[PDB]
């Protein structure tokens, strides 16, 4: 293992500096003996996923906060954690020298890193692209004879995905999402602006658009890539907005319902891609539960829909019971999955804040909140950006857990990276969230899960400046005595048998 090389940039914490010959990394996962726990600690003061161990105690006597594991109270099973292979992410990664490229990929996907097992792939161009294109720009080609993948896929995105798969500790699932259709399918004839598919579900435009999903999966499979799921449209509400600045395709919930029932569902089911799962919404959670009710109460759409994809954007501190919680209650067998999260800013504020602990805490608070309201996975946006938060053809710059500086053959791992890693590294696919109850009201955010092998994982986030003494009770093994320092995040692991 190699430790973090810290660097400050004027915010309240540090980034970790990596280059062609050095990156902070982990030793192979080792689980300590029954009766012992492991603790990984990150702090604003600078600690980065630092490992310590301790004994589980047979008794506990004080007052002070007690968190009791309820292993018999079982909730959702986890699908996974990951991020998005945008054009911008691919360009930033490939700007590094090859050894630095591989250290970046290992940081995300290998057991030397934080064990990502999800990659989101845009279908053709989005705002984090430097060229505007779709896969079928030759007009009025309704049978899509001229559909083809450009070099953005065949030279950049697809080889990088394959390199991640080869480095991965765990099986990786790919999820695809389109931003815009070809413009000759659209009411406004442009990739952006207010506009939807022409006509109505069932007609030539909607049939061709569904066929485009099949052609996309066809083309990626020719390159030996296959998809766990697709979403019906990235952020369908965006294309309803006058002047929307980048690639979009507008759907009301009724339009999405009928597109799924008449075109997308049947087209996918009638193809060799019938096992690919379809996720609806792919948008922010205040559209719930209304969007889910519109789509899923129609049996002819619901029979094709596997789950509901939700975005986090500018709402990291907002509630979740009336949106995620209520949607789970109404549709308890329809999985909820967070497919995109990123930290935006006001127009006059800075897009990237190198070393911001606050943005890290936003990620971990969002992840805990999602997990506590039945969400099965959480997907970051761009895997890497430059120090401007780009490139981005409309200058819609945002932050990213990894910032690449091409002029120094260097990349910086933000607090966001480690806050996400406190979950992704230690919560493999199939882990089940279990109950965790507090003995008294407190300011900590915490979640407990049980690995498929039966061991326990608890994440504890302290967004306050005050240390909080804390004990975790597991009736199978005893008491875990610890302290949650102010401005810290901890992951605790222990064997139960």
């Amino acid at each position: 293992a190699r430790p973090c090389i810290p660097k400050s940039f004027g915010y309240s914490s540090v980034v970790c500096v990596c280059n062609a010959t050095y990156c902070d990394s982990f030793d192979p996962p080792t689980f300590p003996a029954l009766g012992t726990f492991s603790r990984y600690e990150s702090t604003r003061s600078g600690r980065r996923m630092e490992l310590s161990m301790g004994p589980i105690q047979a008794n506990h006597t004080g007052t002070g906060l007690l968190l009791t594991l309820q292993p018999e109270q079982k909730f959702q099973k986890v699908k996974g954690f990951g991020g998005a292979m945008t054009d911008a992410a691919a360009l930033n990664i490939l700007a590094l020298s090859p050894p630095a490229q591989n250290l970046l990929l290992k940081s995300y996907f290998s057991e030397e890193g934080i064990g990502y097992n999800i990659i989101r792939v845009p279908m053709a161009s989005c705002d984090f692209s430097i060229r505007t294109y779709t896969y079928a720009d030759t007009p009025d080609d309704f049978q899509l004879h001229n559909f083809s993948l450009p070099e953005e896929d065949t030279k950049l995105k697809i080889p990088l995905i394959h390199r991640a798969l080869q480095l991965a500790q765990r099986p990786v699932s790919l999820l695809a999402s389109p931003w815009t259709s070809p413009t000759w399918l659209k009411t406004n004839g442009a990739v952006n602006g207010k506009g939807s598919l022409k006509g109505q579900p069932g007609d030539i435009y909607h049939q061709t658009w569904a066929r485009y999903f099949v052609k996309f999966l066809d083309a990626y499979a020719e390159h030996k890539l296959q998809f766990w799921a697709v979403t019906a449209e990235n952020e369908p509400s965006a294309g309803l907005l006058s002047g929307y600045p980048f690639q979009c395709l507008g759907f009301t919930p009724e339009h999405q319902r009928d597109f799924i029932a008449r075109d997308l569902g049947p087209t996918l089911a009638n193809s060799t891609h019938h096992n690919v799962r379809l996720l609806m919404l792919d948008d922010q959670r205040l559209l719930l539960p209304h969007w889910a009710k519109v789509v899923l109460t129609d049996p002819e759409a619901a029979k094709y829909v596997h789950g509901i994809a939700v975005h986090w954007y500018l709402d990291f501190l907002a509630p979740a019971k009336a949106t995620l919680g209520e949607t789970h209650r109404l549709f308890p067998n329809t999985m909820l999955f967070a497919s995109e999260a990123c930290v935006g800013s006001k127009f006059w504020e800075q897009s990237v804040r190198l070393g911001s602990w606050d943005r890290g805490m936003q990620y971990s608070h969002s992840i805990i909140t999602n997990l506590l309201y039945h969400v099965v996975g959480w997907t970051d946006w761009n895997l890497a950006l430059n120090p401007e938060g780009g490139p981005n053809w409309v200058r819609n710059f945002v932050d990213s857990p990894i910032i690449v500086d091409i002029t120094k053959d260097t990349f910086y791992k933000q607090p966001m990276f480690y806050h996400l890693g406190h979950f992704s590294k230690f919560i493999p696919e199939g882990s089940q969230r279990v109950g965790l109850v507090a003995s008294q009201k407190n300011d900590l955010d915490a979640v407990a899960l049980m690995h498929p092998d039966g061991s326990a994982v608890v994440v504890v986030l302290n967004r306050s400046s005050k240390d909080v003494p804390l004990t975790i009770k597991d009736p199978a093994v005893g008491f875990l005595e610890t302290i949650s320092p102010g401005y810290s995040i901890h992951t605790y692991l222990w064997h139960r048998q």
Partner: nanobody
Amino acid sequence: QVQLVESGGGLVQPGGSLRLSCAASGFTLDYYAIGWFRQAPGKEREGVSCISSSDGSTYYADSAKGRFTISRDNAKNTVYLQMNSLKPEDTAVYYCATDRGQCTYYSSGYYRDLRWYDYWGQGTQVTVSS
């Protein structure tokens, strides 16, 4: 000790039916996803059907879709493959295997990946002949 034992194979005529069983020991069926595979002589090993342990969702090869049904007996820790409308092209050794992911042959990133299936049964011969 992870053990998988296939049974139910044998000889059937074209159009006939067979139910294969994969008896699992050394783990519970809420742990591993379980897949059925085949190798027809002269062909590589191919997926037939898989069933997820996370949500019980089922996966099918194009040729199995609508003819075959995978299911679990959770009380007996057994995974069944009901095969209907068999044809001579279905003659093969049939194997069940534990998955390190959730039906990764169909769902994980590398097309038809077999890398994540970590335990395999010895298989059972199915012959479809007049």
